[PDB]
Amino acid sequence: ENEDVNVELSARNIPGVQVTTAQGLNVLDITNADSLVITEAAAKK
Amino acid sequence: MKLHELKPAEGSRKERNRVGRGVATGNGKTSGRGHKGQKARSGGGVRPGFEGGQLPLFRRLPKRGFTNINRKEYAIVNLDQLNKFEDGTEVTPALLVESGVVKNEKSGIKILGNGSLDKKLTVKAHKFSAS
Amino acid sequence: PKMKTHRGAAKRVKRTASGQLKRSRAFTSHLFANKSTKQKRQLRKARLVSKSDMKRVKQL
RNA sequence: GACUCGGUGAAAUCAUAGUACCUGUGAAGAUGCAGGUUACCCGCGACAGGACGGAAAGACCCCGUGGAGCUUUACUGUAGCC
RNA sequence: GACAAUGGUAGGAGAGCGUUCUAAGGGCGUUGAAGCAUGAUCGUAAGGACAUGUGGAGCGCUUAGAAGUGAGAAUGCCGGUG
RNA sequence: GAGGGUAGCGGAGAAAUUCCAAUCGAACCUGGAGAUAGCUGGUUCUCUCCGAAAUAGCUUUAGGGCUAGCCUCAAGUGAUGA
RNA sequence: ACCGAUAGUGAACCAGUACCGUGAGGGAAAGGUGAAAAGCACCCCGGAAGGGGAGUGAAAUAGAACCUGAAACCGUGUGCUUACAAGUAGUCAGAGCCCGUUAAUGGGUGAUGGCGUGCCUUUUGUAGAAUGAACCGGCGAGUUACGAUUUGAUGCAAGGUUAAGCAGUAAAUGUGGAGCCGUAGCGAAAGCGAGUCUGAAUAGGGCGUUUAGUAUUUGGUCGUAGACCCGAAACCAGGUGAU
RNA sequence: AGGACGACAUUAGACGAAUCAUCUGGAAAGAUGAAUCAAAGAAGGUAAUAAUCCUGUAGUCGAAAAUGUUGUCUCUCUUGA
Ligand SMILES: C=C[C@]1(C)C[C@@H](OC(=O)CS[C@@H]2CC[C@@H](N)C[C@H]2O)[C@]2(C)[C@H](C)CC[C@]3(CCC(=O)[C@H]32)[C@@H](C)[C@@H]1O
Ligand SMILES: [Mg+2]
Ligand SMILES: [Mg+2]
Ligand SMILES: [Mg+2]
Ligand SMILES: [Mg+2]
Ligand SMILES: [Mg+2]
Ligand SMILES: [Mg+2]
Ligand SMILES: [Mg+2]
Ligand SMILES: [Mg+2]
Ligand SMILES: [Mg+2]
Ligand SMILES: [Mg+2]
Ligand SMILES: [Mg+2]
Ligand SMILES: [Mg+2]
Ligand SMILES: [Mg+2]
Ligand SMILES: [Mg+2]
Ligand SMILES: [Mg+2]
Ligand SMILES: [Mg+2]
Ligand SMILES: [Mg+2]
Ligand SMILES: [Mg+2]
Ligand SMILES: [Mg+2]
Ligand SMILES: [Mg+2]
Ligand SMILES: [Mg+2]
Ligand SMILES: [Mg+2]
Ligand SMILES: [Mg+2]
Ligand SMILES: [Mg+2]
Ligand SMILES: [Mg+2]
Ligand SMILES: [Mg+2]
Ligand SMILES: [Mg+2]
Ligand SMILES: [Mg+2]
Ligand SMILES: [Mg+2]
Ligand SMILES: [Mg+2]
Ligand SMILES: [Mg+2]
Ligand SMILES: [Mg+2]
Ligand SMILES: [Mg+2]
Ligand SMILES: [Mg+2]
Ligand SMILES: [Mg+2]
Ligand SMILES: [Mg+2]
Ligand SMILES: [Mg+2]
Ligand SMILES: [Mg+2]
Ligand SMILES: [Mg+2]
Ligand SMILES: [Mg+2]
Ligand SMILES: [Mg+2]
Ligand SMILES: [Mg+2]
Ligand SMILES: [Mg+2]
Ligand SMILES: [Mg+2]
Ligand SMILES: [Mg+2]
Ligand SMILES: [Mg+2]
Ligand SMILES: [Mn+2]
Ligand SMILES: [Mn+2]
Ligand SMILES: [Mn+2]
Ligand SMILES: [Mn+2]
Ligand SMILES: [Mn+2]
Ligand SMILES: [Mn+2]
Ligand SMILES: [Mn+2]
Ligand SMILES: [Mn+2]
Ligand SMILES: [Mn+2]
Ligand SMILES: [Mn+2]
Ligand SMILES: [Mn+2]
Ligand SMILES: [Mn+2]
Ligand SMILES: [Mn+2]
Ligand SMILES: [Mn+2]
Ligand SMILES: [Mn+2]
Ligand SMILES: [Mn+2]
Ligand SMILES: [Mn+2]
Ligand SMILES: [Mn+2]
Ligand SMILES: [Mn+2]
Ligand SMILES: [Mn+2]
Ligand SMILES: [Mn+2]
Ligand SMILES: [Mn+2]
Ligand SMILES: [Mn+2]
Ligand SMILES: [Mn+2]
Ligand SMILES: [Mn+2]
Ligand SMILES: [Mn+2]
Ligand SMILES: [Mn+2]
Ligand SMILES: [Mn+2]
Ligand SMILES: [Mn+2]
Ligand SMILES: [Mn+2]
Ligand SMILES: [Mn+2]
Ligand SMILES: [Mn+2]
Ligand SMILES: [Mn+2]
Ligand SMILES: [Mn+2]
Ligand SMILES: [Mn+2]
Ligand SMILES: [Mn+2]
Ligand SMILES: [Mn+2]
Ligand SMILES: [Mn+2]
Ligand SMILES: [Mn+2]
Ligand SMILES: [Mn+2]
Ligand SMILES: [Mn+2]
Ligand SMILES: [Mn+2]
Ligand SMILES: [Mn+2]
Ligand SMILES: [Mn+2]
Ligand SMILES: [Mn+2]
Ligand SMILES: [Mn+2]
Ligand SMILES: [Mn+2]
Ligand SMILES: [Mn+2]
Ligand SMILES: [Mn+2]
Ligand SMILES: [Mn+2]
Ligand SMILES: [Mn+2]
Ligand SMILES: [Mn+2]
Ligand SMILES: [Mn+2]
Ligand SMILES: [Mn+2]
Ligand SMILES: [Mn+2]
Ligand SMILES: [Mn+2]
Ligand SMILES: [Mn+2]
Ligand SMILES: [Mn+2]
Ligand SMILES: [Mn+2]
Ligand SMILES: [Mn+2]
Ligand SMILES: [Mn+2]
Ligand SMILES: [Mn+2]
Ligand SMILES: [Mn+2]
Ligand SMILES: [Mn+2]
Ligand SMILES: [Mn+2]
C-alpha cells in the first residue's frame, strides 16, 4: 500500500505476484516485476 | 496475443446450428415432417411395440475385490511393498500382485494375495511375502 | 439430473465395448426341441445397441 | 321504404386485378389454360344464373388406444345396511 | 495451363452476410451522429459504400467474445388506415 | 309486491335433461396449469456439394413407432464393385 | 456482455386506476416543446375555431395534438401515355416523345409483336372451385440447466484430474487428493488371473491378453425437465353466486 | 434468575485537491495552444463530449439525544473429588 496508491494514474495497475492475472498481464504492453517479485514468480514456476 | 488480435486455436470452435431461421439455410420445417416431429416429440425412450430390451435374467453380488499390480513391479528400486501407494498405485480394496511382464529385480513383495506365476518369478529373483 | 440407469438391464453385463447378454428360452416348456436346449451361450446386440446405447451406460 | 336533392354516415367481406361467351383441357363442373367466337370509354335504376357467393376449422360419416352424460348378472371398488 | 463436375423435395454436410451487446486496439462527430428520404453505385448471394436533403447528438472500423440475431403466411396479438 | 330459505359429489322440478344472473347430460371464479394433444396450423438470412423414401419385419398396430432398407459426413479396408 | 415505452413490473403517466361483472373476480391504454417559457406584443380575416404578417429562438418546415416523423391510406400539380379493345398484369423484342446521371455499350414513358394460370400450406397430383392472408407497421417459435455420447481443439501422459471447504475484490487462482476415470480380464458367484468361463478333459468353444488414457472444451445428437411455438372437449381443489 | 459505571456501531452532518486562452458555435466540457492536481481520472450535472465549472469522489472529522452490541467492574448462585 502506497506503491499501490500509484492507482489513479490512468494506464497503471499494480498487483502482487501470487496475484498476476493472464489478462492484466497482456492488456499490458509493458510490465515491471520488481526484483523480489521477479525472483518469486521465478520461484512459483 | 495482444487482446485486440486474439486468435482461437485452429479447428477449435465452430458456429452453432440455428434451425428455423429461413429456408436457404436448409432448415425451415426445421426437421422431420408430419409425424411425431411434434414438440412433445417422445419417441418412447427406447422401444417398438414388442419390448426386446427384455428377455430373461441372471444375477447376484456379495462383498469382495482387490487391486492389481503386475510383475511390472520392476520399476521400483529394492525391498518392500504396499508403500508404493507413493509411486504407482491408487485405490485399493486390497492389494494383489499379479503376473504378466517378466520380473527384473530382487525385492520383498509384502502384499495381500500373491498371484501364483508372479510368486514363482518374484521368488526366482529372491524375496516373497504374505499378509 | 444424471440420467437414471435402466434397471431392466440387470440383464446384460459390459464386455469390452460390447454387452454380454442373457438368452432365449431358458425355463418353461422344456418338453420341446433338444439340440436347441444346448443354447446356454451369450449374445451382444449389434442392431440393437443402437436402440439401447445410452441406458445401460452408467454400466461402464 | 325504395327513387331525386340537402344533412349525417355504418357493416359483413376482401391474395393483386385491366375480372366476356362456346367447345375443349385440367385435381375428372374454369373471368384467369387451348382454339375459336364476340366486345369503343364511364355511370345510374333493376334481376339473382356463376364467382363450387358470405356467415360457422361439417352436427352426418370415419378416425383418435379423445372427452362427457347414462345402463347393466362388464371389471375393481365403495357410502350405507344385515 | 489443359481436363472433368455443378436440376433437385425430406434431409446430411460446408462457407458466409446482416443485427444488438462486450473486450482490446484504432478512429469519426454541432465545420453535423444515429435515424429518415432520394439516386443512373459496388459485390457471385445475404449484403456494402457514396453524394444530396432532412435531422440535431451520438456513432463506426479491425480482431475476438456472447446472444431476447434475421418474419409473409399461425381464421396469430396490438395499432393504424383502407 | 316486500323480507327471507335451499348452492354444484349440491339444490329446486304438476318431470321438459327443466331452471339455478342472456348457450347447465352437470353453474360461475381462482388455482393445480405451460393438464394432455401419436391431431391440425405456424417455425424468420444467403450461397455451395451430395441427395432420399412412400418398402420388409413386429406392433391394442394400420395417417403412430421400432430395427432393417434407401440419404449424407467421417474414418478404415483396398480391387473385393459395374 | 439485464429492458429501454408493443420492451422492462399489470402499472416509467395519481394502476389494481378508467372500464366489466350481483359477486368471488377480470383489467387496460396513456412517457419525450426548448438550454431556457423566452409559450407568439402588435396588425390583419373570422362569432369563435383556425390562419397570414410581425416577433421569441440555433431551430416553431421545435407552436403545445409540440424531437425524429417510415409505411399503409388521402390529396394537388403534372412529363410520357390511353376511348376496336379479352389483360395473374410481368418478361423479352421495340418505334415515338421527354430528360440528362454516383458517366455507363445512360434515365422516364411505351404504339406494336413473342412468351406467360400469384404465394404459402397440404398433396400421388392444387391456376385450383382445397387451406390461409383486407392492407402497412410493430410483436411473435429448437432455448437453458444438469447428465450421457460423439467429433474437433489443447495440456499432461502409465498416468490424468480435483469436489465441497479455506483464502481472494461476487475473478484465473492459490490451496484442498475425499473422490473419479485409467494401467486386467473372465465367471451368477465363491474365485482365479494374461488369462478365465463352460467342461471329466492338460479337448473344442465364448469373452479377453499383443498396453493410451484422462481433464477441460467448440459442434452434432439423446435423456431429465413445458424442452420448438399456438390450440381442446375435459378433470381436480378452494371459493363466489337463488337480486 | 432482574438491574448500576464506558468503548464501538445505527439513526442528522462537516471538511475535502487542481484551468486558462483562441477557433467554430445559439451555447463549448470539442479542436488547437500552453498549464496544473491526484490516497481524489467513481459517478451525475452544467446551453455539445469536463480529473481541475458545480454536486461529489480518495481521505479525514463529527452525536444533545434514543435504541443497538460489547469490553469490566458491581449483582446472584455455588463443596467439587
Ligand atoms: C352438410 C350438409 C348439407 C347442408 C346437406 C348435405 O346433407 C347431409 O349431409 C345430410 S346429413 C344431416 C345433416 C344435418 C345433421 N345435423 C343431421 C344429418 O342427418 C348434402 C345434402 C349432402 C349429403 C352432402 C354434401 C352437401 C353439399 C351439397 C349437398 O347436396 C349436401 C353438404 C355440404 C351441405 O352443406
Ligand atoms: Mg428383464
Ligand atoms: Mg317515400
Ligand atoms: Mg371494416
Ligand atoms: Mg368492366
Ligand atoms: Mg381440385
Ligand atoms: Mg367441362
Ligand atoms: Mg368416437
Ligand atoms: Mg364404514
Ligand atoms: Mg450496418
Ligand atoms: Mg460518414
Ligand atoms: Mg450551423
Ligand atoms: Mg425516384
Ligand atoms: Mg438507399
Ligand atoms: Mg443542412
Ligand atoms: Mg445524412
Ligand atoms: Mg444536444
Ligand atoms: Mg466511421
Ligand atoms: Mg463474434
Ligand atoms: Mg399476418
Ligand atoms: Mg379473420
Ligand atoms: Mg386491427
Ligand atoms: Mg346460501
Ligand atoms: Mg333431489
Ligand atoms: Mg389421454
Ligand atoms: Mg395415428
Ligand atoms: Mg476413402
Ligand atoms: Mg373484462
Ligand atoms: Mg355473471
Ligand atoms: Mg370479465
Ligand atoms: Mg407533423
Ligand atoms: Mg390526374
Ligand atoms: Mg432510352
Ligand atoms: Mg403497352
Ligand atoms: Mg406485351
Ligand atoms: Mg401455369
Ligand atoms: Mg382483420
Ligand atoms: Mg452453451
Ligand atoms: Mg482428443
Ligand atoms: Mg488428447
Ligand atoms: Mg456437447
Ligand atoms: Mg415448472
Ligand atoms: Mg369440485
Ligand atoms: Mg326472492
Ligand atoms: Mg463570434
Ligand atoms: Mg484508492
Ligand atoms: Mg462528467
Ligand atoms: Mn454454419
Ligand atoms: Mn433441404
Ligand atoms: Mn406442416
Ligand atoms: Mn416423421
Ligand atoms: Mn421437432
Ligand atoms: Mn407441448
Ligand atoms: Mn416405455
Ligand atoms: Mn465384473
Ligand atoms: Mn421346432
Ligand atoms: Mn343523402
Ligand atoms: Mn366486360
Ligand atoms: Mn396442372
Ligand atoms: Mn378430361
Ligand atoms: Mn368452360
Ligand atoms: Mn348497376
Ligand atoms: Mn332482392
Ligand atoms: Mn373439420
Ligand atoms: Mn445442386
Ligand atoms: Mn446439369
Ligand atoms: Mn446441417
Ligand atoms: Mn445503435
Ligand atoms: Mn426473435
Ligand atoms: Mn329425453
Ligand atoms: Mn336444455
Ligand atoms: Mn318448471
Ligand atoms: Mn339461462
Ligand atoms: Mn363444466
Ligand atoms: Mn400438474
Ligand atoms: Mn395448452
Ligand atoms: Mn446431383
Ligand atoms: Mn410372421
Ligand atoms: Mn400387444
Ligand atoms: Mn404421412
Ligand atoms: Mn470384379
Ligand atoms: Mn408497458
Ligand atoms: Mn418510441
Ligand atoms: Mn360497475
Ligand atoms: Mn424538457
Ligand atoms: Mn413569420
Ligand atoms: Mn431569430
Ligand atoms: Mn401525431
Ligand atoms: Mn432533442
Ligand atoms: Mn414532430
Ligand atoms: Mn385506338
Ligand atoms: Mn382465351
Ligand atoms: Mn428491352
Ligand atoms: Mn398468351
Ligand atoms: Mn415459409
Ligand atoms: Mn386459394
Ligand atoms: Mn376463382
Ligand atoms: Mn385443412
Ligand atoms: Mn380468406
Ligand atoms: Mn402483418
Ligand atoms: Mn470464500
Ligand atoms: Mn483350451
Ligand atoms: Mn481359449
Ligand atoms: Mn479366441
Ligand atoms: Mn444441446
Ligand atoms: Mn436418434
Ligand atoms: Mn430438444
Ligand atoms: Mn465540500
Ligand atoms: Mn472540488
Ligand atoms: Mn473554455
Ligand atoms: Mn449533456
Ligand atoms: Mn468518503
What is A14-27 written as a DSSP string? ---SS---TTTTTS
How many domains is chain C built from?
1
Pair B21, B32: CB distance under 8 Å? no
Amino acid at B114: N
Give the residues across from B68 on adjacent strands: B96
On the CB side of B84, CA atoms within 13 Å amount to 25
Q: Å resolution of this model?
A: 3.5
Terminal alpha carbon distance of chain C: 18
Strand partners, B96: B68
Pairing verdict, β C12-14 and C19-21: antiparallel
Residue type, B15: E
Quick one: DSSP state of residue B114? Answer: B
Whether the CB of B66 is less than 7 Å away from nucleic strand G comes out as yes
Are the beta carbons of C10 and C56 closer than 8 angstroms? no
Contact B118, B71 (CB under 8 A): yes
Whether the CB of B63 is below 8 Å from some CB of chain A: the reply is no
Whole-number Å distance, CA B24 to C1' E13?
Answer: 14
**B19 vs B24, B32, B49, CA distance in Å?**
11, 12, 31
How far is the C-alpha of B90 from the C-alpha of A43, rounded, in Å? 30
The helix or strand, by DSSP H or E, that contains position B67, with its residue range, turns out to be strand B67-70
Length of chain B: 131
Size of interface B-C (CB pairs under 8 A): 33
| C12-to-B8, C9, C26, C46, C54 alpha-carbon distances in Å | 44, 6, 15, 14, 13
Domain that holds residue C40: 1-60
Question: How was this one solved?
Answer: X-ray
Q: How far off is chain A from B2, nearest CA to CA, in Å?
A: 7
A29: closest chain B residue by CA: B2
Cβ–Cβ under 8 Å, residues B28 and B22:
yes
How far is B95 from A40, CA to CA, in rounded Å? 42
Helix (H, G, I), strand (E, B) or coil at C5: coil
Distance of residue B98 Cα from the nearest chain C Cα, in angstroms: 21
Return the CA Rg of chain C. Answer: 14
Cα-based distances in Å from A33 to A14, A39, B81: 10, 9, 47
3-class DSSP assignment, residue A38: helix
Contact C11 B56 (CB under 8 A): yes
Using the beta-carbon criterion (under 8 Å), do A23 and B2 form an inter-chain contact? no
Interface membership of B60 toward C (CB under 8 Å):
no
CA–CA gap between residue B59 and residue B37 (Å, rounded): 39
Beta carbons of B123 and B99 less than 8 angstroms apart: no
